[PDB]
């Protein structure tokens, strides 16, 4: 029954991917950012310069006030609001209606994005990081509890896309799905066991790759890397592309770089392979990222979409684009496969490949 959910996402890596939802009775239609990096469902509920519409609780006969406030900070932006519950549906999702927790956003700071076309956020991660605490049941938990929707979803982000709620649509990917364990149910936390650039091992202690966590986050644009890993990767990418020279602010994500339309020198930029812990003992697999993913288009002009982090690795939208990503909550694992909407180079291709042998993978997790 998944064909109804194919292509139910709109947006881009830079401003977020959103799905259409309705809240309340009669249904009020809103576009909702798909965020695997948080766990609160929240919607604009007061006028705002960047909102073209918002949730009006006074117009919904099924609205219930919870008489409790809430604030949620993100890496970029934050909001505060008032908690309640209401009936929620996804028109291009499963044919169900659930009563879900909803934060009515009344004040916000650098959260809504001008011209993004979304008015709320769907946090798909686990209750452990929900605000104000883990007793506020996340949307997907309510969906699974109240309906027969299986406890998994998958995301095909195309650099539009698809959020398949309750399963896997095999027409959306090619080759094999490779699975990595969800290390802990809070963020979608994973363990990176090896990193190669153009086939050259970065040869860092693999704990550095996951310091202090590594997560899969559809709501972050960039591949974000811990400082030490970021410095090693930039040095290697600079070396591979030293044919040309770029402003020092290009590598910080500030300045864009442009080339005569159709002459982008893709071949001077390396591929990046991230090896992830596998399902069996001493087994990993790799996903390979092309420069067409980490040079985000904005002549042909691009921003460098690899940036530094102090809260661990973030596999953001530019990594997820071109892969089909299965958030298999029931089996505590995340699957990767080459997406049907994959990145096209002429001599290189994004890939998900295995198996690989990797010893001592448990040592790669940070404590
Ligand atoms: C340095 N720096 C600011 C970043 O690296 C960055 C970039 C980014 C989003 C976040 C962080 C962010 O905080 N993302 C949030 C959660 O996933 C993680 O906490 C979700 C969120 C919150 C507000 C607006 C959003 C997404 O817009 C989506 C468009 C893409 C914006 O790209």
Contact 323, 287 (CB under 8 A): yes
Check if 256 has its Cβ closer than 6 Å to any atom of ligand 1: no
Strand-pair partners of 342: none
Do residues 292 and 272 touch, judged by C-beta distance below 8 A? no
State in Å: Cα 78 to ligand 1 middle: 10
Q: Is 217 considered catalytic here?
A: yes
Q: Give a three-class secondary structure readout of 128-194.
A: HHCCCCCCCCCHHHHHHHHCCCCCCEEEEECCCEEEEECCCCHHHEEEEEEEEECCCECCEEECEEE
Q: How many Cα atoms occupy the beta-carbon half-sphere of 326 within 13 Å?
A: 25
Quick check: CB of 119 below 6 Å from ligand 1? no
Pairwise CA distance, residues 224 & 217, whole Å = 10
Which residues, 6 or more positions from 15, have their beta carbon under 8 angstroms from its beta carbon?
113, 115, 116
Ligand 1 in contact with 292 (CB < 6 A)?
no
CA distances from 141 to 28, 106, 148, 156, 255 (A): 22, 25, 12, 21, 41
* Rounded Cα distance, 234 and 240, in Å: 10
Atom of ligand 1 nearest to the CA of 307: 5
Please tell me if the CB atom of residue 208 comes closer than 6 angstroms to any atom of ligand 1: no
CA 155 to CA 138: how far, in whole Å? Answer: 18
Catalytic member of 133, 169, 212, 217? 217
SS3 250: coil
With beta carbons less than 8 A apart as the criterion, state whether 339 and 324 touch.
yes
The answer to whether 34 and 18 are in contact (CB under 8 A) is yes
11 lines ligand 1 (CB under 6 A): no
Q: How far is the centre of ligand 1, averaged over its atoms, from the C-alpha of 76 (Å)?
A: 5
CB atoms within 10 A of CB 263: 9
Backbone φ/ψ region at 16: left (φ over 0), alpha (ψ -120 to 50), beta: left
The three-point CA angle 349-350-352 to 5° equals: 125
Rounded distance between C-alpha atoms, residue 244 and residue 238, angstroms:
9
Q: Is omega for the bond preceding 124 within 30 degrees of 0, making it cis?
A: no
Q: After which residues is the chain broken (C to N over 2.5 A)?
A: 159, 298
How far apart are the two ends of the chain, measured CA to CA in Å?
Answer: 42
Q: Where are the alpha helices (DSSP H) in the chain?
A: 139-146, 227-240, 291-294, 317-320
Contact between 202 and 233 under an 8 Å Cβ cutoff? The reply is yes
Peptide bond into 212 cis (omega under 30): yes
Measured CA to CA, the distance from residue 241 to residue 329 in angstroms comes to 40
Experimental method: X-ray
How many Cβ atoms from other residues are within 10 Å of residue 141's Cβ?
Answer: 19
> 344 φ, ψ to 5°?
-115, 110
With the most atoms of ligand 1 within 8 angstroms of its CB, the residue from 13, 72, 76, 77 to mutate is 76
Q: How far apart are CA 101 and CA 119, in angstroms?
A: 16
Residue 208, φ and ψ in degrees, nearest 5: -60, -30
Q: Which of 289, 292, 244 is nearest to 271 (CA)?
A: 289
Do the beta carbons of residue 208 and residue 364 sit within 8 Å? no
Q: Is 97 in the pocket of ligand 1 (CB under 6 A)?
A: no
**Three-state DSSP state, 229:** helix
Q: Do 196 and 209 meet the contact criterion of CB atoms below 8 Å apart? A: no
Q: Which atom of ligand 1 is nearest to the CA of 77?
A: 23
> For the stretch 298-325, what's the b/e string if a residue is b when 16 or more beta carbons lie within 10 angstroms of its beta carbon?
eeeebbbbbbbbeebbbbbbbbbbbbbb
CA of 73 to the centre of ligand 1 (A): 10
**Angle, vertex CA 140, rays to CA 139 and CA 144, nearest 5:** 120
174 lines ligand 1 (CB under 6 A): no
Contact of 355 with 278, CB cutoff 8 Å:
yes
Domains of the chain in start order, with CATH, are: 17-149 (2.40.70.10), 150-367 (2.40.70.10)
**Measured from the CB, is residue 15 less than 6 Å from ligand 1?**
yes
354 neighbors 277 (Cβ within 8 angstroms): no
- If you take atom 25 of ligand 1, which residue's CA is the nearest one? 219
Residue 207: which residues within 8 A CB-CB, separation 6 or more? 363, 364, 365, 366
**Residues whose CB falls within 8 Å of the CB of residue 227, separated by 6 or more in sequence, listed in order:** 308, 309, 310
Distance CA 221, CA 301 (A): 17
Measured between alpha carbons, how far is 144 from 98 in angstroms, rounded to an integer? 9
Residues 6+ apart with CB under 8 A from 64: 84, 85, 86
96 HSE (CA, 13 A, CB side): 18
**Ligand 1 centroid distance, CA of 217 (Å):** 9
Q: Report how far residue 304's alpha carbon sits from residue 251's, in angstroms, rounded to the nearest whole number.
A: 6
Distance 287 CA to ligand 1 centre (A): 23
The resolution, in angstroms to one decimal, equals 2.1
218 lines ligand 1 (CB under 6 A): no
Active site residue 248: no
CA of 220 relative to ligand 1 center, distance in Å: 5
* β 120-123/351-357 pair status: unpaired
φ, ψ for residue 310, nearest 5 deg: -115, 5
How much helix, strand and coil, in percent to the nearest 5, is found in the chain?
15, 40, 45
Residues in the chain: 367
| Tally of CA atoms within 13 A in the half-sphere of 97 that contains its CB | 10
């Amino acid at each position: 029954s998944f064909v109804e959910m194919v292509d139910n996402l709109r947006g881009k890596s830079g401003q977020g991917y959103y799905v259409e939802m309705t809240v309340g009775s009669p249904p009020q239609t809103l576009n909702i950012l798909v965020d695997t990096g948080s766990s609160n469902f929240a919607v604009g509920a007061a006028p705002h310069p960047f909102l073209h519409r918002y949730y009006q609780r006074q117009l919904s006969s099924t609205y219930r006030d919870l008489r409790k406030g809430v604030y949620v900070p993100y890496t970029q932006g934050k909001w505060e609001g008032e908690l309640g519950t209401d009936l929620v549906s996804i028109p291009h999702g499963p044919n169900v209606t659930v009563r879900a927790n909803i934060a009515a956003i009344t004040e916000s700071d650098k959260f809504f994005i001008n011209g993004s076309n979304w008015e709320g956020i769907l946090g798909l991660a686990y209750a452990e990081i929900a605000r104000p605490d883990d007793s506020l049941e996340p949307f997907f938990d309510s969906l699974v509890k109240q309906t027969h929707v299986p406890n998994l979803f998958s995301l095909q982000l195309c650099g539009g896309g698809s959020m398949i709620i309750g399963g896997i649509d095999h027409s959306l990917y090619t080759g094999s799905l490779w699975y990595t364990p969800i290390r802990r149910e809070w963020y979608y936390e994973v363990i990176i066991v090896r990193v190669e650039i153009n086939g050259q091992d970065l040869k860092m202690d693999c704990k550095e790759y996951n310091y202090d966590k590594s997560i899969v986050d559809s709501g972050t644009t960039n591949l974000r890397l811990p400082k030490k890993v970021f410095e090693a990767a930039v040095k290697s990418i600079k070396a591979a592309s030293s044919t040309e020279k770029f402003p020092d602010g290009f590598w910080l994500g500030e300045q864009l770089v442009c080339w005569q339309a159709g002459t982008t020198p893709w071949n001077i930029f390396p591929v990046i392979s991230l090896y992830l812990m596998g399902e069996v003992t001493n087994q990993s697999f790799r996903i390979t990222i092309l420069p067409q993913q980490y040079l985000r288009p904005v002549d042909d002009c691009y921003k460098f979409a690899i940036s530094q982090s102090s809260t661990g690795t973030v596999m953001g939208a530019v990594i997820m684009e071109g892969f089909y990503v299965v958030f298999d909550r029931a089996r505590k694992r995340i699957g990767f496969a080459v997406s049907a909407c994959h990145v096209h180079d002429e001599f290189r291709t994004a890939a998900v490949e295995g198996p690989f042998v990797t010893l001592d993978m448990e040592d790669c997790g940070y404590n």
